[PDB]
Symmetry: D3
Subunit: 306 residues, 6 copies
């Protein structure tokens, strides 16, 4: 089947649009979903090959029930709120995700405008974030972000639904969380203390050894193995965002996975901890203010809608 | 003397930072002004020649008197609110302008972060806009934006203070207005109707001929001839901005001129109207929610 | 398995369309050149890779085929079918060999055209030569974005590549060329809104007109074909602007590839002869076809094995 | 104070050379186009800045000057001087206006040429139109690097722009154009070493032959000129490859700018009429001039102030 | 399933070739780095993407294989076979580990080389370190385009990657390295025509000499090899210029990847021992091999899983 | 006058060639000097505009006397060896400098090859360094290198000989030193400790406050004010180089100045120290193994021989 552009080339700009569908908004939404590929072509084609404009469209659990009368993707459910001893992963409203990426913010904005034009009156905006690449693929904590993402066949194997849910093959599960950083608290750490928090060297992005990597580092808690001892993997495209005047320095977290169980296991280790880690130290400097789970179906699922 | 980067090469990204100096914030502000060129080099240098990072720093009339003793720039005064028959050009608070431009937002955001971090607790944010290049130098109305800006020597005679105010030579006057657009109304016009509002053909960016250019087109009202019959010019770097969710479709207007009078003449013709023109038809689709005037000194002045 | 020619090229800014006839006795020279044309393409192109994007798709006409080769022929290979509509005519013009040369740069196309024609000197007569150039944001001389609804990836291969329906010629394709000249003065007399009604898409934003407003005689309405099984019948186009300002020649070089000529020829019949609902494609009221040729572009190994 | 036209252009990979004659009574229309030509350059080009690099250098012939303007003539303006050499002829061909249009892309050149001709259609007759393209690593149709010894910076400004010697026309220049067609068959018949003896430079490495080896009838030998003070007399060239493979047209469009036409004309006399040591420039044994025209390209403000 | 190393790399302008031997007791340190080398590639390369194009292909010699790994050996892995020809010798020199590091920039190559050699310090003895740079037009130190006839796509995969014939090692390849020093004074004494007869291609145009013209002792004649089924036997090369102007060192670092070492060895036999028609490859009259090593470059996941 | 490309656009790649002129090599060198700009165009023009190929040609004090009749440049003299309490700036032989830069090492190598092709048997190689910039203009110590270089008119003012020595106007003075780093010792410091050595922040390249910048930091000691109480500036294009096998991790230092006195004062502060600093902390991790001074004349001086 034909996947949406979950595996995107390198992109320097992104818009995350999360909306809820208003009472009676379903027909307008279905019409828009049947045209969303066509609208990405209308905005993007003229700018190819360099524009690299794509939209990954996601649908929430409750939205799915409202929109489609047939089978549901096997792993689709509302985002699971996590109430950890110190940190909380909040569950916030979100029926439709538009994960818009390009080499330029103008292409993202132009597509977001077309999509919201078609949806005006049928949806209510919940979140809008304009993400930007920050230096050499760094995030707002100044660490390279995306290093250990799977690539090529491993990325497709990690992200794209297959024979386990054949009606939904080539779909994926997207988890979003908007994080705001305490940059005063962070900049109070030495680089070495920051490296102990993340689990990688700051300037050179080399993973700390097994012997020095803390158990409560971000890398330690988000490194997960299945029972066969193979790494369980997700595909992240985290995007810096913010407003200097309001002291908002953010990471917009997005992780794609073939099943949400992997992303949810990483989140549990982060927020609830383990026997050797109280919680992910990154959360002592990062507050999640959104949390939503969406299924991003195969492109042909959206194209074939009435 | 050496100007700030008022005459910047074209940039695809910008941050417009307007702040008020809090009571007691003067010394922190003067120390930052000392270092703003150094912070620009610190953030920008390593981004090669492609980064094109610059910050143009401007000081408002009220701020000037709080910050500096002695002579004031000849043309420095607060933004003049225009109460037109239909359209208003509001005057809004602004002591400091940071006009940050680069080929990338990150360079703009990183330099904005350095500047605001130094001023934290000395200033109150008034406005912050993250501008992006829109297609082939187009604006939110879908028209090419910058076409008739002066270049080279003509740009320097238009924007840079010279012998007429010797102690402020190499400075400029910046006027900013944040505009929000009625895109629903605008998209209601035929392309031909839109071309009559702007005064240029939409796709080809060809100026309408004298015989068909409406007197209340944007181009007609912002074309000003001086005492000698030559064009009085300004240098604009207008930037699209917005939020699709809140239906904010924005033009951040910034015009630089040797003297505020040229920019002020254009605003009066636009908002107050003329014998031949009720007002600039662009204002039937564009609302000004800020208006501020700044003097952007010579680089040497800031130290 | 059979290696296709580069029918599916990444986007290219420059093209040379070279159409020649094979002179009496020229067949042996042509066969030698056909066995070397892939080798010449590597000679010119390799040093400019990866950005050069140089390729040549070689096509052979119906009459030329029978002059060059013995035994089985491509199932759909026939001379271009002249269409005499009530208003507009699609002429058939001579053409035995097509070289469809594309690159990121005209020089690579020019150099390869020179190598090919140097090998065919004394064996072929020039019929048509057009040097195409990208025109702003993938626009044509009518000022509309051209290529937006092309199929991509697997859908593109399915549309253009001969397969099991003609297995001896699997990996080949059918190219239809028509050199069009536009009446720009006539076109510029129409409002943008009237032009959008002719094409069926919005001019600046390239958004397809809604089903309620798209005219039945619009280009997009008449070149949108659904098969009896309900699926879209697709072709892959690489239309190239060309012209001469002094001669007031403003053209579209139309090239369309399809796994059978039937799809392309259906679109042509609808355009030139119209339907129940449309006298003819309104684009032809501003566009004159001055050439018409059909070629079979065989699998690369067919040409190499000669 | 005088603003030159873009005589000294950055390197541009595309050009259009448009030479036209002014019809009887076409003067008023041409004067209006000259007063608008910079505004049309901005209309087409500004949207593509900074990478587009679109410029038009507008040139006026000797006869055309007298039809269009009263007051002073530029000091060096006269019709191109036909050279009738013992073997080779530099023909004088009609041309009243030159538009030398350059950009990083042909589309911009073509769009600007289209706007200019749209204004002049009823007032002028096209005489020559050439679409030039960069060929490999700044090479010409003879396979040699072309432009190497051009002056740059201050030296170029001093060699090209009218100053104190003609104060009313300061910031102008003199353009000599010649369209050359090459006998590529004959050229490729030479060894690389024989080609190097014709040009005066090493072919692949572009290293100038030493004084002891450089033939006196080499191109470099005859187009190397010294003034009375003994310093080099220089022109600024922007020669552009062009051609048509089917018509076997392999062209160099020669254009040379000089502060006075006398430097360019001495080079032409040495090439075509030869010296004590050289019958003629050996490049002419492989190159035939089919046009020859001389233009004054005035300061931009001279054209604006019409 | 199996993940090949970046044997099939995008064209790269920079390379570092590192050959080391494993000291007494160096096995554990080496295995640890082998398990980390992909991780270190990402640490250095990710933050430089997508322009960086950093990769490292890691090879293991025959002797080193038995020191490091339990279980099966690759079926074709053996020490480099010295060829003592009538005139020229293919020397064998020591090498346990190969790091074939490539990127768009030498500084990225050097950063990865640093990390690898930092981990190996005290466990290995450096044998050879070459910093390769390609010329503008994929041209080598002899001034010929180098890579033209490399296979691409499926044919490259077919030629290079171990498949069903040795299934435990599928996705691996065999690397042969030879560092060549050129006699540039002797080479530059030849005419271009004479140099073309040595290589078997035209120097400027990179057009292959016809079978009737290509000398039997030409580099292209002797390295063109057919199977027992008449099909081409191919290898994938990425030869890099290197050297030192002070020391008058002008080199080609040869690296050839093949599914079996037998194809590369057949080519080396033809070059150094000649045929019935050729004493030896004329390229060796200007090129001396000073190193020779054979390595197995396993599937990436073989090294990852140590 | 036409300066050489001393004020170059940023370049990723460099070759530094230092040679001595053999006995009887003067005429061959003179011929090469008269052609070196011609050769730079030969290799560089067809690579434009992205190639950014230039060569700056420098002549040492002793060689000037062997090569030229006429006036000597005012400031030209042998590099002065500095014997500090801890660190030494060695003086090493050098008659000709070829400072070759481009976006690509192949362009540098092609030009170095044509230059050394012409000088074969007239000169002896002393140093050859192939330099590579890290991305973001970072050096072998991981720091952005070039940040406070003067630009535009300020750079012209700091670098080019003017009316002070009008027969050599458009010239400049190049000091070279090849530094080998102790990378193991360097990578032992915290980022914070390295920032105290350099005097700038590592990731953000923001200069340390006056209140925290150590007096023995590299920025503090290479920051010079003249009598006027205004900045004495040089123009640097330092290039990482090395060899992983030999554990050679280097910075090739090159500084251009209108007069050598400015560069030499910086070297005196670095190596001999001040009232408030024993020596430049950068020298605790950097050993100079070469040191030479050249005059890089106006291009037209070399052309007109
Ligand atoms: C404040 C929010 C976050 C920030 C700033 C952040 C930043 C980073 C950084 C700097 C790395 C190391 C480089 C890399 O491999 O990408 C990393 C790795 C990773 N992060 Fe995050 N991250 C955040 C949230 C999350 C969340 C919520 C999850 C999962 C639900 C997650 C999953 C991962 C994974 C799986 C890795 C790779 C670990 C490995 O296999 O080495 N991250 N992140
Ligand atoms: C909603 C706000 C604005 C928008 C969208 C806008 C857009 C444009 C456009 C599309 C053009 C034509 C192309 C060009 O030459 O740049 C233009 C021209 C111009 N605008 Fe604006 N503009 C705005 C506000 C202003 C304001 C407030 C001023 C002056 C105070 C101004 C002064 C000019 C001038 C001087 C020109 C050049 C006219 C000429 O000489 O042809 N604009 N503007
Ligand atoms: C005569 C000059 C022609 C011009 C200027 C032209 C131009 C265009 C334009 C502007 C579009 C809409 C954008 C797109 O999807 O590409 C389009 C679409 C199309 N054209 Fe053409 N066209 C021409 C001739 C033809 C011919 C002769 C055919 C078929 C034989 C054809 C087949 C198509 C198809 C299939 C589409 C896509 C329609 C859809 O599925 O939405 N065109 N063309
Ligand atoms: C007919 C086709 C022409 C071709 C193919 C051609 C080609 C070349 C080439 C390959 C060079 C050497 C590299 C360089 O640009 O410096 C050159 C140099 C030159 N050409 Fe031409 N040229 C032609 C006609 C002309 C004409 C008609 C003139 C003068 C009226 C001219 C004047 C020059 C000059 C002045 C030089 C520089 C010589 C020097 O100082 O080294 N060329 N040309
Ligand atoms: C001095 C060392 C070498 C140099 C400078 C060199 C250079 C070249 C050049 C210029 C080509 C022509 C363009 C191309 O197809 O890549 C070529 C082709 C080739 N070289 Fe080499 N080569 C060298 C050593 C070797 C060695 C040692 C082998 C094999 C063990 C080899 C195998 C080949 C092969 C197979 C081809 C392609 C021939 C074909 O099928 O057309 N080369 N080489
Ligand atoms: Mg017409």
């Amino acid at each position: 089947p034909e996947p949406q552009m979950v595996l995107s080339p390198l992109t320097s700009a992104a818009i995350f649009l999360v909306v809820t569908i208003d009472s009676g908004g379903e027909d307008t939404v279905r019409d828009l979903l049947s045209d969303v590929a066509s609208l990405e072509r209308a905005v993007g084609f003229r700018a190819q090959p360099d524009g690299r404009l794509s939209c990954v469209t996601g649908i929430g659990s409750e939205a799915w029930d409202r929109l489609f009368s047939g089978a549901r993707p096997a792993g689709l459910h509302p985002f699971r709120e996590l109430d950890g001893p110190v940190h909380r992963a909040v569950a916030t409203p979100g029926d439709l995700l538009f994960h818009i990426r390009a080499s330029r913010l103008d292409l993202c904005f132009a597509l977001a405008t077309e999509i919201m034009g078609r949806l005006r009156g049928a949806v209510t905006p919940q979140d809008e974030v304009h993400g930007f690449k920050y230096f050499d693929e760094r995030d707002m904590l100044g660490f390279v972000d995306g290093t250990e993402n799977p690539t090529g066949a491993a990325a497709r194997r990690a992200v794209l639904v297959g024979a386990e849910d054949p009606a939904f093959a080539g779909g994926s599960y997207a988890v979003v969380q908007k994080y705001l950083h305490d940059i005063d608290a962070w900049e109070g750490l030495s680089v070495e203390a920051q490296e102990r928090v993340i689990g990688r060297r700051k300037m050179t992005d080399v993973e700390l050894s097994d012997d020095v990597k803390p158990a409560d580092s971000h890398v330690a808690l988000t490194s997960v193995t299945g029972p066969d001892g193979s790494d369980l993997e997700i595909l992240r495209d985290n995007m810096p965002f913010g407003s200097v005047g309001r002291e908002e320095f953010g990471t917009y977290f997005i992780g794609y996975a073939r099943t949400p169980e992997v992303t949810e296991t990483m989140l549990e280790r982060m927020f609830l901890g383990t026997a050797s880690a109280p919680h992910d130290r990154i959360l002592d400097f990062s507050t999640a203010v959104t949390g939503s789970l969406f299924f991003t179906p195969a492109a042909d699922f959206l194209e074939d809608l009435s």
